[PDB]
RNA sequence: GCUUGAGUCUCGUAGAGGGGGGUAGAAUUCCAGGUGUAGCGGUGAAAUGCGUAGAGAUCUGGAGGAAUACCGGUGGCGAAGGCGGCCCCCUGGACGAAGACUGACGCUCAGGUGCGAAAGCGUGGGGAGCAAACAGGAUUAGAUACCCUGGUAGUCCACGCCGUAAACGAUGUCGACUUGGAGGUUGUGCCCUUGAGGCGUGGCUUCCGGAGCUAACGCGUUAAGUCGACCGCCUGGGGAGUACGGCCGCAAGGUUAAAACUCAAAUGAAUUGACGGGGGCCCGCACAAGCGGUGGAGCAUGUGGUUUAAUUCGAUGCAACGCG
């Protein structure tokens, strides 16, 4: 696999929640980069987009909501 | 009484004992049965068979309410937790949902020390 | 985690989702903060993971059979 | 043993009836290797079974045996630092042989006068299910069904 | 516990016999319940040597100790047997 | 004077670097209420403990404290100690590309000065969970311990003190030089960004190995190789990092640092065994599955012991005792 964020020159922001729900699992946990194959730089800022979307209720913390 | 149709069957699934209780959609309980009260005591409380006998003893005394469909909640890393649900669909129930609701802290309070 | 599947009842399709990360987590929050043994165990882990990489790559020479 | 799945050998059948099942039965109570003394007691004990039950002789013997044969057997299993009685289902070639051993050990006690009638009384009472041979079968099942909590198989 | 004291070229006295049984009363209760004891004392021109064979509920255990004046030999023999009795005891506890 | 060391500046980049303030969700505990009924909790088993005054389970609401699942990575950053949710404010360093600038401004330091895990200490708070001490229940020959149920300082916050750790890479700082391979992470240049492409080039970092080195184990461009600069330190084992003295500290204590006496060793690495209540694999009436015995009875016989003028001598765990 590869990183589509490195395929372009875009920025992973928290407001683009359509592309973040394929990066979390079926219970709200973040999928590791050893499965997805993301670069380590973009994976670190991806989780910063997951954690900000969880604060603004665009993504759930757990599945019991 | 109230003759409710759909319910929720919570399963507490500790290591030493398995507790199964049956409630409704609103969340207030109807009846319960444990593996320690089914005649199994001590080493046999931590058996999946003892969680089965706790289920059919709880599948009875809810005949007064008339449940034919229920959800299943499991909570704990027990030796039961799946042999209990096999004793419910065999008891004549429609299992709509099976849900894991075990408590996981996102790193909170300190657990006790590892015993040696 | 949440299976509301139709047809024939057989958790079977439930233990695929649940035995994923619902018992390794609860058995390690079961006791002891550790605070430094995680480190030891963690560092022993990957010194034995590259022991599987650097031996099985060198095991493809022959097999004496 | 460790090795050697043993090459099993056969038994010659009974002369009076075409059965090796009763020839296995006469070999069990054959004490000190005395077969003519063993076979005279069992023939005198099953003709007594016919008049005390009405039926024919040989099929009245196994109807006292299906009432005394077990289906599960409990074992001591060593696991951890202790050892509990796990139950296991019995193979059928052991199932009858475990049954007719329970008959003879109940026949050496339950002391009446002669050995032929000592065997003849409870071979009837095995069919009416009140003798002490059936109480060995039911108290084995009482311990195995109490220990249903030990088993990775569900049959 | 039944003692059986026996000497090869060491004719046992009365003070030595009670010295054995008082010492073998120690390794008694304090370590394990035992069935039957055979004690053998030997003198071999230098070595006051004392053997002992204990019989327990599991098996048997034997120890030997050569010493200085036949009193230190039995004093070293009991310390050899007491350690074998604690090793055998915890082999039969496994809690 | 010069620019190559060192430093300044202009652009960027990554980061659990630090300090301050806010805030979110999960979970534990407690409180209150609803439902509900005889158990819960715990262990190898058990009891203490809790519960018919309604526990536990379940649902709603509330209070409070501490910690930030997944991401999380032989990943990153920091001089070391250390630093993980998220947001803002203040702030330190490293690094790269292309230049410009000062012109040896450098390196290393005894004393000195600052920083410095955890525990502890002082004053003032806070206190969910955990938990020294302590209390009870077990286990045990005993258990002052391991296990169990509780549980106080402490853990948390502010401001001071302490100045110690297997504070470790058991490897001082700085500079130069000397075959390679597989990576991780983070900048950047060129060519066909024409495709996550190809070629390079830096920084930090992980592993494996060459020469050489080392007592060996190993180290191996981040040396323990080959050299230079300076500093700290070592001089047989015990006594002893102890006594005394000085200094520092509220205290605990830290630091500096002996001698008398005593021993002929202490020690390092590796080798062959043996052993392990280490691991794997295998066998034996070894266990299991069965049958018949012994131990209990009288007697035959042998031994120990006692007795005797002598009860001849030898055999003594298995492998002596119906044996010579």
PDB file of C-alpha atoms (C1' of nucleotides) in Angstrom, chain F residues 2-252:
ATOM      1  C1'   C F   2      42.885  34.631   5.142  1.00  0.00           C
ATOM      2  C1'   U F   3      38.222  31.207   5.697  1.00  0.00           C
ATOM      3  C1'   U F   4      38.147  25.851   6.171  1.00  0.00           C
ATOM      4  C1'   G F   5      36.869  25.836  12.922  1.00  0.00           C
ATOM      5  C1'   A F   6      33.289  28.609  15.685  1.00  0.00           C
ATOM      6  C1'   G F   7      29.255  32.113  15.443  1.00  0.00           C
ATOM      7  C1'   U F   8      25.345  35.775  13.272  1.00  0.00           C
ATOM      8  C1'   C F   9      21.389  36.489   9.646  1.00  0.00           C
ATOM      9  C1'   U F  10      17.707  35.437   5.647  1.00  0.00           C
ATOM     10  C1'   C F  11      13.782  31.303   4.330  1.00  0.00           C
ATOM     11  C1'   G F  12      11.566  26.922   5.722  1.00  0.00           C
ATOM     12  C1'   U F  13      10.581  21.786   8.233  1.00  0.00           C
ATOM     13  C1'   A F  14       9.663  18.017  11.973  1.00  0.00           C
ATOM     14  C1'   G F  15       8.942  17.228  17.252  1.00  0.00           C
ATOM     15  C1'   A F  16       5.267  13.452  24.170  1.00  0.00           C
ATOM     16  C1'   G F  17      11.338  20.147  24.426  1.00  0.00           C
ATOM     17  C1'   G F  18       9.644  23.407  28.513  1.00  0.00           C
ATOM     18  C1'   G F  19       6.265  26.833  31.473  1.00  0.00           C
ATOM     19  C1'   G F  20       0.983  28.804  32.108  1.00  0.00           C
ATOM     20  C1'   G F  21      -4.352  28.631  31.369  1.00  0.00           C
ATOM     21  C1'   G F  22      -8.726  26.198  29.413  1.00  0.00           C
ATOM     22  C1'   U F  23     -11.460  21.913  27.947  1.00  0.00           C
ATOM     23  C1'   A F  24     -13.314  16.887  26.157  1.00  0.00           C
ATOM     24  C1'   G F  25     -14.590  11.712  26.370  1.00  0.00           C
ATOM     25  C1'   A F  26     -13.973   6.632  28.443  1.00  0.00           C
ATOM     26  C1'   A F  27     -13.656   4.302  33.187  1.00  0.00           C
ATOM     27  C1'   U F  28     -13.382   3.570  38.750  1.00  0.00           C
ATOM     28  C1'   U F  29     -15.579   5.149  43.305  1.00  0.00           C
ATOM     29  C1'   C F  30     -19.455   7.577  46.046  1.00  0.00           C
ATOM     30  C1'   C F  31     -24.339   9.835  46.535  1.00  0.00           C
ATOM     31  C1'   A F  32     -29.776   9.921  45.122  1.00  0.00           C
ATOM     32  C1'   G F  33     -33.918   7.628  42.686  1.00  0.00           C
ATOM     33  C1'   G F  34     -36.511   3.584  39.625  1.00  0.00           C
ATOM     34  C1'   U F  35     -36.886  -1.678  38.697  1.00  0.00           C
ATOM     35  C1'   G F  36     -35.669  -6.236  40.962  1.00  0.00           C
ATOM     36  C1'   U F  37     -34.431 -10.671  44.702  1.00  0.00           C
ATOM     37  C1'   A F  38     -30.765 -13.914  47.358  1.00  0.00           C
ATOM     38  C1'   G F  39     -26.898 -13.887  46.861  1.00  0.00           C
ATOM     39  C1'   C F  40     -22.362 -11.048  45.876  1.00  0.00           C
ATOM     40  C1'   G F  41     -17.208 -10.705  46.241  1.00  0.00           C
ATOM     41  C1'   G F  42     -12.854 -13.732  46.485  1.00  0.00           C
ATOM     42  C1'   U F  43      -9.521 -18.114  45.822  1.00  0.00           C
ATOM     43  C1'   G F  44      -5.509 -23.579  43.875  1.00  0.00           C
ATOM     44  C1'   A F  45      -9.747 -24.362  47.526  1.00  0.00           C
ATOM     45  C1'   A F  46     -11.583 -21.389  51.518  1.00  0.00           C
ATOM     46  C1'   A F  47     -12.685 -17.663  54.981  1.00  0.00           C
ATOM     47  C1'   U F  48     -12.592 -12.555  56.589  1.00  0.00           C
ATOM     48  C1'   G F  49     -15.806  -8.710  54.057  1.00  0.00           C
ATOM     49  C1'   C F  50     -20.740  -7.236  51.868  1.00  0.00           C
ATOM     50  C1'   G F  51     -26.261  -8.366  51.513  1.00  0.00           C
ATOM     51  C1'   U F  52     -33.346  -9.438  53.417  1.00  0.00           C
ATOM     52  C1'   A F  53     -32.191  -2.329  57.164  1.00  0.00           C
ATOM     53  C1'   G F  54     -32.676  -4.953  49.899  1.00  0.00           C
ATOM     54  C1'   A F  55     -26.648  -6.010  48.139  1.00  0.00           C
ATOM     55  C1'   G F  56     -24.791  -7.520  43.468  1.00  0.00           C
ATOM     56  C1'   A F  57     -26.821  -6.925  38.536  1.00  0.00           C
ATOM     57  C1'   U F  58     -29.605  -2.923  35.611  1.00  0.00           C
ATOM     58  C1'   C F  59     -31.270   2.289  34.315  1.00  0.00           C
ATOM     59  C1'   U F  60     -31.391   7.741  34.967  1.00  0.00           C
ATOM     60  C1'   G F  61     -29.257  12.034  37.170  1.00  0.00           C
ATOM     61  C1'   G F  62     -25.338  14.227  40.096  1.00  0.00           C
ATOM     62  C1'   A F  63     -20.659  15.003  42.656  1.00  0.00           C
ATOM     63  C1'   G F  64     -15.375  14.623  42.693  1.00  0.00           C
ATOM     64  C1'   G F  65     -10.361  13.274  41.859  1.00  0.00           C
ATOM     65  C1'   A F  66      -6.511  11.191  38.998  1.00  0.00           C
ATOM     66  C1'   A F  67      -4.917   9.306  34.336  1.00  0.00           C
ATOM     67  C1'   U F  68      -5.018  10.238  28.863  1.00  0.00           C
ATOM     68  C1'   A F  69      -7.302   3.619  25.361  1.00  0.00           C
ATOM     69  C1'   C F  70      -6.840   3.295  19.790  1.00  0.00           C
ATOM     70  C1'   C F  71      -3.144   6.434  17.240  1.00  0.00           C
ATOM     71  C1'   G F  72       1.997   4.248  19.325  1.00  0.00           C
ATOM     72  C1'   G F  73       5.908   2.950  16.114  1.00  0.00           C
ATOM     73  C1'   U F  74      14.572  -1.347  18.359  1.00  0.00           C
ATOM     74  C1'   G F  75       9.153   6.187  16.418  1.00  0.00           C
ATOM     75  C1'   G F  76      10.263  11.595  17.915  1.00  0.00           C
ATOM     76  C1'   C F  77      12.300  15.524  21.110  1.00  0.00           C
ATOM     77  C1'   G F  78      15.556  17.085  25.266  1.00  0.00           C
ATOM     78  C1'   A F  79      22.460  18.114  28.193  1.00  0.00           C
ATOM     79  C1'   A F  80      20.912  14.346  31.448  1.00  0.00           C
ATOM     80  C1'   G F  81      16.747  13.412  34.730  1.00  0.00           C
ATOM     81  C1'   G F  82      12.777  13.042  31.552  1.00  0.00           C
ATOM     82  C1'   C F  83       8.426  14.278  28.229  1.00  0.00           C
ATOM     83  C1'   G F  84       2.043  11.216  25.515  1.00  0.00           C
ATOM     84  C1'   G F  85      -5.963  13.439  24.835  1.00  0.00           C
ATOM     85  C1'   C F  86      -7.249  18.332  22.668  1.00  0.00           C
ATOM     86  C1'   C F  87      -6.966  24.024  22.212  1.00  0.00           C
ATOM     87  C1'   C F  88      -4.692  28.803  23.070  1.00  0.00           C
ATOM     88  C1'   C F  89      -0.584  32.075  25.076  1.00  0.00           C
ATOM     89  C1'   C F  90       4.673  32.697  26.286  1.00  0.00           C
ATOM     90  C1'   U F  91       9.367  30.207  25.084  1.00  0.00           C
ATOM     91  C1'   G F  92      14.227  26.949  24.229  1.00  0.00           C
ATOM     92  C1'   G F  93      17.123  24.021  20.905  1.00  0.00           C
ATOM     93  C1'   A F  94      18.100  21.000  16.657  1.00  0.00           C
ATOM     94  C1'   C F  95      18.029  20.598  11.224  1.00  0.00           C
ATOM     95  C1'   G F  96      17.991  21.539   5.826  1.00  0.00           C
ATOM     96  C1'   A F  97      18.391  24.502   0.988  1.00  0.00           C
ATOM     97  C1'   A F  98      20.554  28.736  -1.333  1.00  0.00           C
ATOM     98  C1'   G F  99      23.434  32.865  -0.186  1.00  0.00           C
ATOM     99  C1'   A F 100      25.333  36.974   2.667  1.00  0.00           C
ATOM    100  C1'   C F 101      28.426  38.475   7.139  1.00  0.00           C
ATOM    101  C1'   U F 102      32.302  38.789  11.344  1.00  0.00           C
ATOM    102  C1'   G F 103      37.329  36.729  10.842  1.00  0.00           C
ATOM    103  C1'   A F 104      40.224  31.706  15.245  1.00  0.00           C
ATOM    104  C1'   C F 105      36.133  34.871  18.242  1.00  0.00           C
ATOM    105  C1'   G F 106      38.093  27.686  19.389  1.00  0.00           C
ATOM    106  C1'   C F 107      38.378  22.983  22.506  1.00  0.00           C
ATOM    107  C1'   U F 108      38.525  21.212  27.481  1.00  0.00           C
ATOM    108  C1'   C F 109      38.235  22.382  32.554  1.00  0.00           C
ATOM    109  C1'   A F 110      40.215  21.668  39.302  1.00  0.00           C
ATOM    110  C1'   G F 111      37.386  24.960  42.408  1.00  0.00           C
ATOM    111  C1'   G F 112      32.543  27.291  41.463  1.00  0.00           C
ATOM    112  C1'   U F 113      27.454  27.581  39.569  1.00  0.00           C
ATOM    113  C1'   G F 114      22.873  25.528  37.746  1.00  0.00           C
ATOM    114  C1'   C F 115      19.777  21.250  36.516  1.00  0.00           C
ATOM    115  C1'   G F 116      18.747  16.545  38.490  1.00  0.00           C
ATOM    116  C1'   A F 117      13.743   9.766  38.635  1.00  0.00           C
ATOM    117  C1'   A F 118      11.451   7.822  42.773  1.00  0.00           C
ATOM    118  C1'   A F 119      10.992   7.873  47.932  1.00  0.00           C
ATOM    119  C1'   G F 120      11.263  11.437  51.842  1.00  0.00           C
ATOM    120  C1'   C F 121      10.692  16.536  54.387  1.00  0.00           C
ATOM    121  C1'   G F 122       8.225  21.667  55.577  1.00  0.00           C
ATOM    122  C1'   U F 123       3.877  24.978  55.064  1.00  0.00           C
ATOM    123  C1'   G F 124      -0.847  25.362  52.751  1.00  0.00           C
ATOM    124  C1'   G F 125      -4.618  22.594  49.832  1.00  0.00           C
ATOM    125  C1'   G F 126      -6.731  18.332  47.463  1.00  0.00           C
ATOM    126  C1'   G F 127      -7.806  13.093  48.022  1.00  0.00           C
ATOM    127  C1'   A F 128     -11.270   8.959  42.969  1.00  0.00           C
ATOM    128  C1'   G F 129      -8.213   4.798  42.269  1.00  0.00           C
ATOM    129  C1'   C F 130      -3.888   2.518  44.059  1.00  0.00           C
ATOM    130  C1'   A F 131      -1.320   1.568  48.403  1.00  0.00           C
ATOM    131  C1'   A F 132       3.969   1.308  52.819  1.00  0.00           C
ATOM    132  C1'   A F 133       2.467   0.926  57.826  1.00  0.00           C
ATOM    133  C1'   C F 134      -1.395  -1.406  60.278  1.00  0.00           C
ATOM    134  C1'   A F 135      -5.824  -4.787  60.959  1.00  0.00           C
ATOM    135  C1'   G F 136      -8.309  -9.309  59.943  1.00  0.00           C
ATOM    136  C1'   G F 137      -8.753 -14.136  56.943  1.00  0.00           C
ATOM    137  C1'   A F 138      -5.903 -18.107  54.911  1.00  0.00           C
ATOM    138  C1'   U F 139      -1.515 -21.137  53.678  1.00  0.00           C
ATOM    139  C1'   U F 140       2.184 -23.307  56.886  1.00  0.00           C
ATOM    140  C1'   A F 141       5.852 -27.086  61.519  1.00  0.00           C
ATOM    141  C1'   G F 142       6.048 -21.619  62.274  1.00  0.00           C
ATOM    142  C1'   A F 143       4.431 -17.223  58.218  1.00  0.00           C
ATOM    143  C1'   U F 144       5.951 -11.859  61.593  1.00  0.00           C
ATOM    144  C1'   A F 145       5.934 -13.027  53.980  1.00  0.00           C
ATOM    145  C1'   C F 146       4.023 -14.500  49.080  1.00  0.00           C
ATOM    146  C1'   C F 147      -2.295 -15.026  48.510  1.00  0.00           C
ATOM    147  C1'   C F 148      -7.253 -12.686  50.287  1.00  0.00           C
ATOM    148  C1'   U F 149     -10.589  -8.601  52.334  1.00  0.00           C
ATOM    149  C1'   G F 150      -9.922  -3.883  54.169  1.00  0.00           C
ATOM    150  C1'   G F 151      -6.812   0.217  54.783  1.00  0.00           C
ATOM    151  C1'   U F 152      -3.365   5.401  56.752  1.00  0.00           C
ATOM    152  C1'   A F 153       0.785   8.358  55.188  1.00  0.00           C
ATOM    153  C1'   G F 154       2.132   8.709  50.264  1.00  0.00           C
ATOM    154  C1'   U F 155       0.771   9.149  45.165  1.00  0.00           C
ATOM    155  C1'   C F 156      -2.079  14.973  43.148  1.00  0.00           C
ATOM    156  C1'   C F 157      -1.614  20.836  43.344  1.00  0.00           C
ATOM    157  C1'   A F 158       1.294  25.456  44.838  1.00  0.00           C
ATOM    158  C1'   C F 159       5.928  27.080  46.997  1.00  0.00           C
ATOM    159  C1'   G F 160      10.569  25.521  49.275  1.00  0.00           C
ATOM    160  C1'   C F 161      14.108  21.466  50.965  1.00  0.00           C
ATOM    161  C1'   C F 162      16.630  16.898  49.803  1.00  0.00           C
ATOM    162  C1'   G F 163      20.814  16.016  45.818  1.00  0.00           C
ATOM    163  C1'   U F 164      20.424  10.280  45.764  1.00  0.00           C
ATOM    164  C1'   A F 165      19.462   5.430  41.701  1.00  0.00           C
ATOM    165  C1'   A F 166      21.672  -0.884  37.994  1.00  0.00           C
ATOM    166  C1'   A F 167      21.008   8.406  37.522  1.00  0.00           C
ATOM    167  C1'   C F 168      23.364   2.312  32.504  1.00  0.00           C
ATOM    168  C1'   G F 169      25.181   2.434  26.480  1.00  0.00           C
ATOM    169  C1'   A F 170      27.777  -0.277  33.542  1.00  0.00           C
ATOM    170  C1'   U F 171      31.266   3.164  27.443  1.00  0.00           C
ATOM    171  C1'   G F 172      33.591  11.550  29.775  1.00  0.00           C
ATOM    172  C1'   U F 173      33.822  15.788  26.250  1.00  0.00           C
ATOM    173  C1'   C F 174      35.704  17.450  21.419  1.00  0.00           C
ATOM    174  C1'   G F 175      38.084  16.864  16.555  1.00  0.00           C
ATOM    175  C1'   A F 176      40.189  13.976  12.442  1.00  0.00           C
ATOM    176  C1'   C F 177      40.811   9.355   9.736  1.00  0.00           C
ATOM    177  C1'   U F 178      39.639   4.104   8.125  1.00  0.00           C
ATOM    178  C1'   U F 179      35.788  -1.755   3.617  1.00  0.00           C
ATOM    179  C1'   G F 180      30.166  -2.597   3.465  1.00  0.00           C
ATOM    180  C1'   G F 181      24.722  -4.318   3.815  1.00  0.00           C
ATOM    181  C1'   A F 182      19.424  -3.947   5.385  1.00  0.00           C
ATOM    182  C1'   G F 183      16.236  -0.371   7.500  1.00  0.00           C
ATOM    183  C1'   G F 184      13.501   3.621  10.418  1.00  0.00           C
ATOM    184  C1'   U F 185      12.664   8.891  10.807  1.00  0.00           C
ATOM    185  C1'   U F 186      13.206  13.960   8.994  1.00  0.00           C
ATOM    186  C1'   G F 187      14.768  18.024   5.301  1.00  0.00           C
ATOM    187  C1'   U F 188      16.246  18.881   0.196  1.00  0.00           C
ATOM    188  C1'   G F 189      18.385  19.012  -5.266  1.00  0.00           C
ATOM    189  C1'   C F 190      18.016  17.343 -10.414  1.00  0.00           C
ATOM    190  C1'   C F 191      15.783  14.510 -14.419  1.00  0.00           C
ATOM    191  C1'   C F 192      10.484  12.422 -18.147  1.00  0.00           C
ATOM    192  C1'   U F 193       5.707  15.760 -11.147  1.00  0.00           C
ATOM    193  C1'   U F 194       5.249  13.001 -17.413  1.00  0.00           C
ATOM    194  C1'   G F 195       3.361   7.096 -12.541  1.00  0.00           C
ATOM    195  C1'   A F 196       3.241   6.313  -5.021  1.00  0.00           C
ATOM    196  C1'   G F 197       9.158   7.253 -10.946  1.00  0.00           C
ATOM    197  C1'   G F 198      14.516   7.482 -11.217  1.00  0.00           C
ATOM    198  C1'   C F 199      19.186   9.671  -9.611  1.00  0.00           C
ATOM    199  C1'   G F 200      21.380  12.161  -5.622  1.00  0.00           C
ATOM    200  C1'   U F 201      22.502  14.683  -1.093  1.00  0.00           C
ATOM    201  C1'   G F 202      22.192  16.136   4.419  1.00  0.00           C
ATOM    202  C1'   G F 203      20.694  15.374   9.871  1.00  0.00           C
ATOM    203  C1'   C F 204      19.468  12.047  13.770  1.00  0.00           C
ATOM    204  C1'   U F 205      18.573   6.627  14.678  1.00  0.00           C
ATOM    205  C1'   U F 206      18.174   0.803  14.649  1.00  0.00           C
ATOM    206  C1'   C F 207      20.318  -3.860  13.281  1.00  0.00           C
ATOM    207  C1'   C F 208      24.010  -7.228  11.108  1.00  0.00           C
ATOM    208  C1'   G F 209      28.947  -7.715   9.931  1.00  0.00           C
ATOM    209  C1'   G F 210      34.899  -6.555   7.398  1.00  0.00           C
ATOM    210  C1'   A F 211      39.764  -5.128   8.700  1.00  0.00           C
ATOM    211  C1'   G F 212      41.782  -4.049  13.174  1.00  0.00           C
ATOM    212  C1'   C F 213      41.188  -4.344  18.390  1.00  0.00           C
ATOM    213  C1'   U F 214      39.969  -7.187  23.000  1.00  0.00           C
ATOM    214  C1'   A F 215      41.623 -12.037  28.246  1.00  0.00           C
ATOM    215  C1'   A F 216      37.393 -13.687  25.970  1.00  0.00           C
ATOM    216  C1'   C F 217      32.465 -12.112  25.424  1.00  0.00           C
ATOM    217  C1'   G F 218      32.150  -8.817  21.964  1.00  0.00           C
ATOM    218  C1'   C F 219      32.992  -3.705  19.571  1.00  0.00           C
ATOM    219  C1'   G F 220      32.938  -2.490  14.579  1.00  0.00           C
ATOM    220  C1'   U F 221      32.270   5.011  10.585  1.00  0.00           C
ATOM    221  C1'   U F 222      27.258   6.671  16.446  1.00  0.00           C
ATOM    222  C1'   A F 223      34.443   1.849  17.829  1.00  0.00           C
ATOM    223  C1'   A F 224      35.752  -0.639  22.522  1.00  0.00           C
ATOM    224  C1'   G F 225      39.742   0.518  15.280  1.00  0.00           C
ATOM    225  C1'   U F 226      43.747   4.307  14.144  1.00  0.00           C
ATOM    226  C1'   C F 227      45.256   9.273  16.479  1.00  0.00           C
ATOM    227  C1'   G F 228      45.352  14.281  18.947  1.00  0.00           C
ATOM    228  C1'   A F 229      43.484  17.930  23.136  1.00  0.00           C
ATOM    229  C1'   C F 230      41.891  18.301  28.123  1.00  0.00           C
ATOM    230  C1'   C F 231      39.374  16.488  32.461  1.00  0.00           C
ATOM    231  C1'   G F 232      37.484  12.860  35.973  1.00  0.00           C
ATOM    232  C1'   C F 233      39.089   8.259  37.997  1.00  0.00           C
ATOM    233  C1'   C F 234      41.811   3.157  39.381  1.00  0.00           C
ATOM    234  C1'   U F 235      46.001   0.504  42.379  1.00  0.00           C
ATOM    235  C1'   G F 236      44.551  -7.207  46.074  1.00  0.00           C
ATOM    236  C1'   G F 237      39.783  -9.068  48.847  1.00  0.00           C
ATOM    237  C1'   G F 238      37.214  -8.008  53.657  1.00  0.00           C
ATOM    238  C1'   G F 239      37.135  -3.812  57.289  1.00  0.00           C
ATOM    239  C1'   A F 240      34.389   0.458  54.290  1.00  0.00           C
ATOM    240  C1'   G F 241      32.211   4.357  51.175  1.00  0.00           C
ATOM    241  C1'   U F 242      32.459   2.845  57.415  1.00  0.00           C
ATOM    242  C1'   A F 243      34.704   5.670  61.811  1.00  0.00           C
ATOM    243  C1'   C F 244      36.500  10.607  63.193  1.00  0.00           C
ATOM    244  C1'   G F 245      36.817  15.776  61.540  1.00  0.00           C
ATOM    245  C1'   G F 246      35.021  19.650  58.209  1.00  0.00           C
ATOM    246  C1'   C F 247      31.086  21.395  55.017  1.00  0.00           C
ATOM    247  C1'   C F 248      25.954  21.198  53.654  1.00  0.00           C
ATOM    248  C1'   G F 249      20.627  19.662  55.320  1.00  0.00           C
ATOM    249  C1'   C F 250      14.498  21.102  59.259  1.00  0.00           C
ATOM    250  C1'   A F 251      15.170  15.897  59.500  1.00  0.00           C
ATOM    251  C1'   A F 252      16.351  11.462  56.920  1.00  0.00           C
TER     252        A F 252
END
